[PDB]
Paper text:
The Cry48Aa/Tpp49Aa pair is produced by a number of L. sphaericus strains and is composed of Cry48Aa, a 135-kDa protein belonging to the 3-domain family of Crystal (Cry) proteins, and Tpp49Aa, a 53 kDa protein belonging to the family of Toxin_10 pesticidal proteins (Tpp). Mosquito toxicity bioassays have revealed that both components in combination are required for activity against Culex quinquefasciatus larvae. Within each Tpp49Aa1 monomer, two distinct domains exist: an N-terminal lectin-like head domain covering residues 49–214 and a C-terminal putative pore-forming domain (PFD) covering residues 215–464. The final model of Tpp49Aa1 revealed the presence of a homodimer forming an “X” structure with a large intermolecular interface, similar to that described for natural heterodimeric crystals of Tpp1Aa2/Tpp2Aa2.
Residue numbers in the entry:
A (entry chain B), B (entry chain A): 49 to 464
Write the structure that this text describes.
Amino acid sequence: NLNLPEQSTRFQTIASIHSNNCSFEILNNDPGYIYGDSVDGECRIAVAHRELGNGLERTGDDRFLFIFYALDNNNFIIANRHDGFVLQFLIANGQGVIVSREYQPNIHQEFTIQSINSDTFRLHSRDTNTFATVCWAQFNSWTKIVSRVDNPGAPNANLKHRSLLTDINMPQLPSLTPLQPLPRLTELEDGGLSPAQAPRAIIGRTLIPCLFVNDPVLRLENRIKQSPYYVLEHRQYWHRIWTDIFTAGERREYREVTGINNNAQNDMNKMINITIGADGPNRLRFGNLSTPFRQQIIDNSNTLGSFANTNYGTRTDIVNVFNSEFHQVRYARFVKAYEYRLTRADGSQVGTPWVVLDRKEMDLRTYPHNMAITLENVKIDNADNSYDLSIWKTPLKLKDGKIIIENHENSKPYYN
Amino acid sequence: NLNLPEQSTRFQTIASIHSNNCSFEILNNDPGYIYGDSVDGECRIAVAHRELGNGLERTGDDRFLFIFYALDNNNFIIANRHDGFVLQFLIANGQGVIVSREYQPNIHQEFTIQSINSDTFRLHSRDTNTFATVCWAQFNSWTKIVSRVDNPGAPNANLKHRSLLTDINMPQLPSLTPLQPLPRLTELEDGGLSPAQAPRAIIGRTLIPCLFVNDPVLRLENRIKQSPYYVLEHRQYWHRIWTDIFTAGERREYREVTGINNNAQNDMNKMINITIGADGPNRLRFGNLSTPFRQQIIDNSNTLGSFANTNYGTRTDIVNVFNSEFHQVRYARFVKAYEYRLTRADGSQVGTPWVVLDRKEMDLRTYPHNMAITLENVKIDNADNSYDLSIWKTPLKLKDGKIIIENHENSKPYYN
C-alpha cells in the first residue's frame, strides 16, 4: 500500500492542451540561443542557461519525461529522466522563465499542481503566483517555457500529460516483520546466535528520492533511469556482545563497546543527508537535502525526529559480572541493534549498513535454563560525548530471557 | 505502533533546572498585574494579557500541565490542560514574553525542543531565535516567563520536566481490516446487504489534536482533559443504490445520486477543517487549522492530498437498464463508498459520518447467479461542478460479481 500521487510513481510528458504535438523539453542551451520558429521579441532569444523548449514530442526521449517528487508541504520537485536536473522558476532580464538546475533545494524548485478537471492542470510556482506555459501562446511553435501571472490575455496555462512511462524501476518494498525472541541455548557449548546469524526484523521502510542519494557507483543521470527511488530499511536484531562458560562463583570483567562510530555517521550523512541523533538509536537528524521529505521518511521508516544538536557516538563500559549460581553456566549477553540499510530499486545494497548498538536494552540466554548472572559494577571507560552518562544501578540480576530497558529506577549518573 | 515523541503522548510540567520548586504556570492576568516576590523593574509588572508565572508546582494542578502537539516541520504547539490555550511568543513594551492564546495557528505558537542532554532541553521560538526562561533569572521567585536571545548576561534557559501525567485518555486505535467481497444472493427475495448492514473495512485511522475539533458538546477546556486526541477513520463499504426483480426483457430507468452533498462537506469543514477534493473520494483539502499536520494525517489515514480548487459534489445520472436474460432475475447494484468517521478517546461518535459514493467503482449481485443486466444509456441529469463529466460507454454488460472501474477505454465525455 504505497501512499503516493500517481505523478510520483511514473514519468510523464507536460504539454499545453492547446498544442497539437508539442511538449516541455529539457535544453542545454546558453543565453543568445535563437528559437527559429518564434516571432521576434523576448520569446525568440534565450536569456538563461538551460531554458525549456516547446518541442515536438518523441516517444521515449528522456528530455520530455518528468517525475514529480512529493514534498511534505504538498509541493513537488520536478526531475527529468535525461540528466536528473529539476525545474526552477527564474527571473532573467525581467522575464519569468522555467529552467533546469541541480536539486538544491530552494523555494523556486517547488511547484504546486492545480487540477482544473480530471485531465487538465496548471503548474504553480511557490511564492511568485506564476503559471508555466508557452511564450506568447505559440503552442505549436519552437519557443521557450515561461512562468507568468494570471491576467486577461495572458497565454492559457492549462496543461496535460501527453504520454506516460509506467515501467520506471520502482522498488518492491519488503514486508514488515516483528522482532522474534532469541532461541533458548541447547547445551554448555552453545554460544547463541552471532551477529551475522541473528534474524533481522523489518520495523520500517521508506522510499528515498535518488536526487540526494550520493550512490558511489551511479551518477545522477543513471540513478534517475535505473533507481529513481532508493529504499531505506529500519531493521532490528539481537546483537551478542559476549558469551562464556562460568564456574560456580566465577567473576569476569568485559569491555562493552556500544553506540555507533563517527565514521559510520559521516558515511550515512554523505550518502543520504541523515544522521542518528544522540537522543536515541531511532532518532533522525535531517540536513538541508532530506528535510523537505522528513515527515514521510519518519512515518514510513517508523523512526522519530531527533531534538539533539549532537550525533550518537560510541561508549566503552567496563562491566564486572559474578556467577552467584552454584552451577557451571553458559551465559550469552545481547544488546538490541538498530540496522539502517540502503538498497537500489534492483535490491542491490549501496554500502555497509549503519548499526547502532543500544546499551539501554539488553537480554540474556543461559544453559542450563532460568539461570541468572549478577552485574556487580559498571564504569564508563570512555565516551565520544557527554549527552548520556547514565549507568546501571548495581547490583543488578540479569535473568535468562528477561529483557531489561533503562529507566529512572534502574540507572544513575556515573559519579554517584 | 504509535509514531509520536513521548512529549506528545503525556502531559508534563516545565521548569528551570535552577528552580528548587517552581514551574511554568498558566495565568488569566491583565497588564498592570503585580508579581509580589519579584525585584522592581520589567519583571514585577505584567505587560500582556495571560502572561505565564514561575509558580510553586502543585501535583495535579492543570495550570502547570502541557502537551506537545507534533507538527510536520518538527516544531510543536504547546497546549495547557486547564483551558486548552497554547503558548505564544509576544513582544509587548519591547519585552519578549510567553503568553497563552487560542490556537490560531501562527508562527509565534511554534516551538522547537533543543536537547542539551538526556534530561535537559531549551524551548526555542525559531523565527525570533529566543529561548523561554524566568525573568532576570529569579528561578525561586513568583515572576513572569520571558523569551530572550542568547547573550553573556542572559538568564540560563536550560529546562526540565518536573512531573508527568501519563494517564491522559489516549484513544485505542482500531485494527486495519480489508474490504470483503459482497456475499452471493441466496434467492429472488434476497435484496443483498443494505448500506446500514454492509461491513466496513478500516483502511486507515489517524489521531487528530483536539485543538481544532469543534465537538458540538465538549468545549475546549473539557476536550483537552477527556479527549486530547480524536480519531479520524477512513472506512470503505459496498453501498447498494438499487435492487429489483426483472422479468425477461424488462426495461427500467433509475436516478443514481452519487458523490457527497454540499451540507456534509460544510459539516466536515466546521468539525475538523478538512474537505474532500473533487479529484477523488480519498483526496483531502486542508484549511489553515489542519494544514500543519497534513502529512501525518495523510500517512496514517491512507488518503492523498487533493490538487483541486473545488470540493467533491453530487451528480445525478439517469440510467436505462435492460434484462436481456431469458429469466426472472433479482439484480442488486452497488457503488464503492468512502466513509469518514470521527470518535472521541472513549470511542463515542462525534456526529454523522461523511460519505462519498464513488460512481467510478461498481459491482452487481444476481439471483440466479452469473446473470448479466445491460446498461443501455447514461445521461447526466445535473452536477454541482464540471470537474468530472465522464459517462460509461454503452451498451455495457454488468455481470454478477465483476467489479468495473472507470478507465479511458470504458468511458467518454457526456456530449459524445
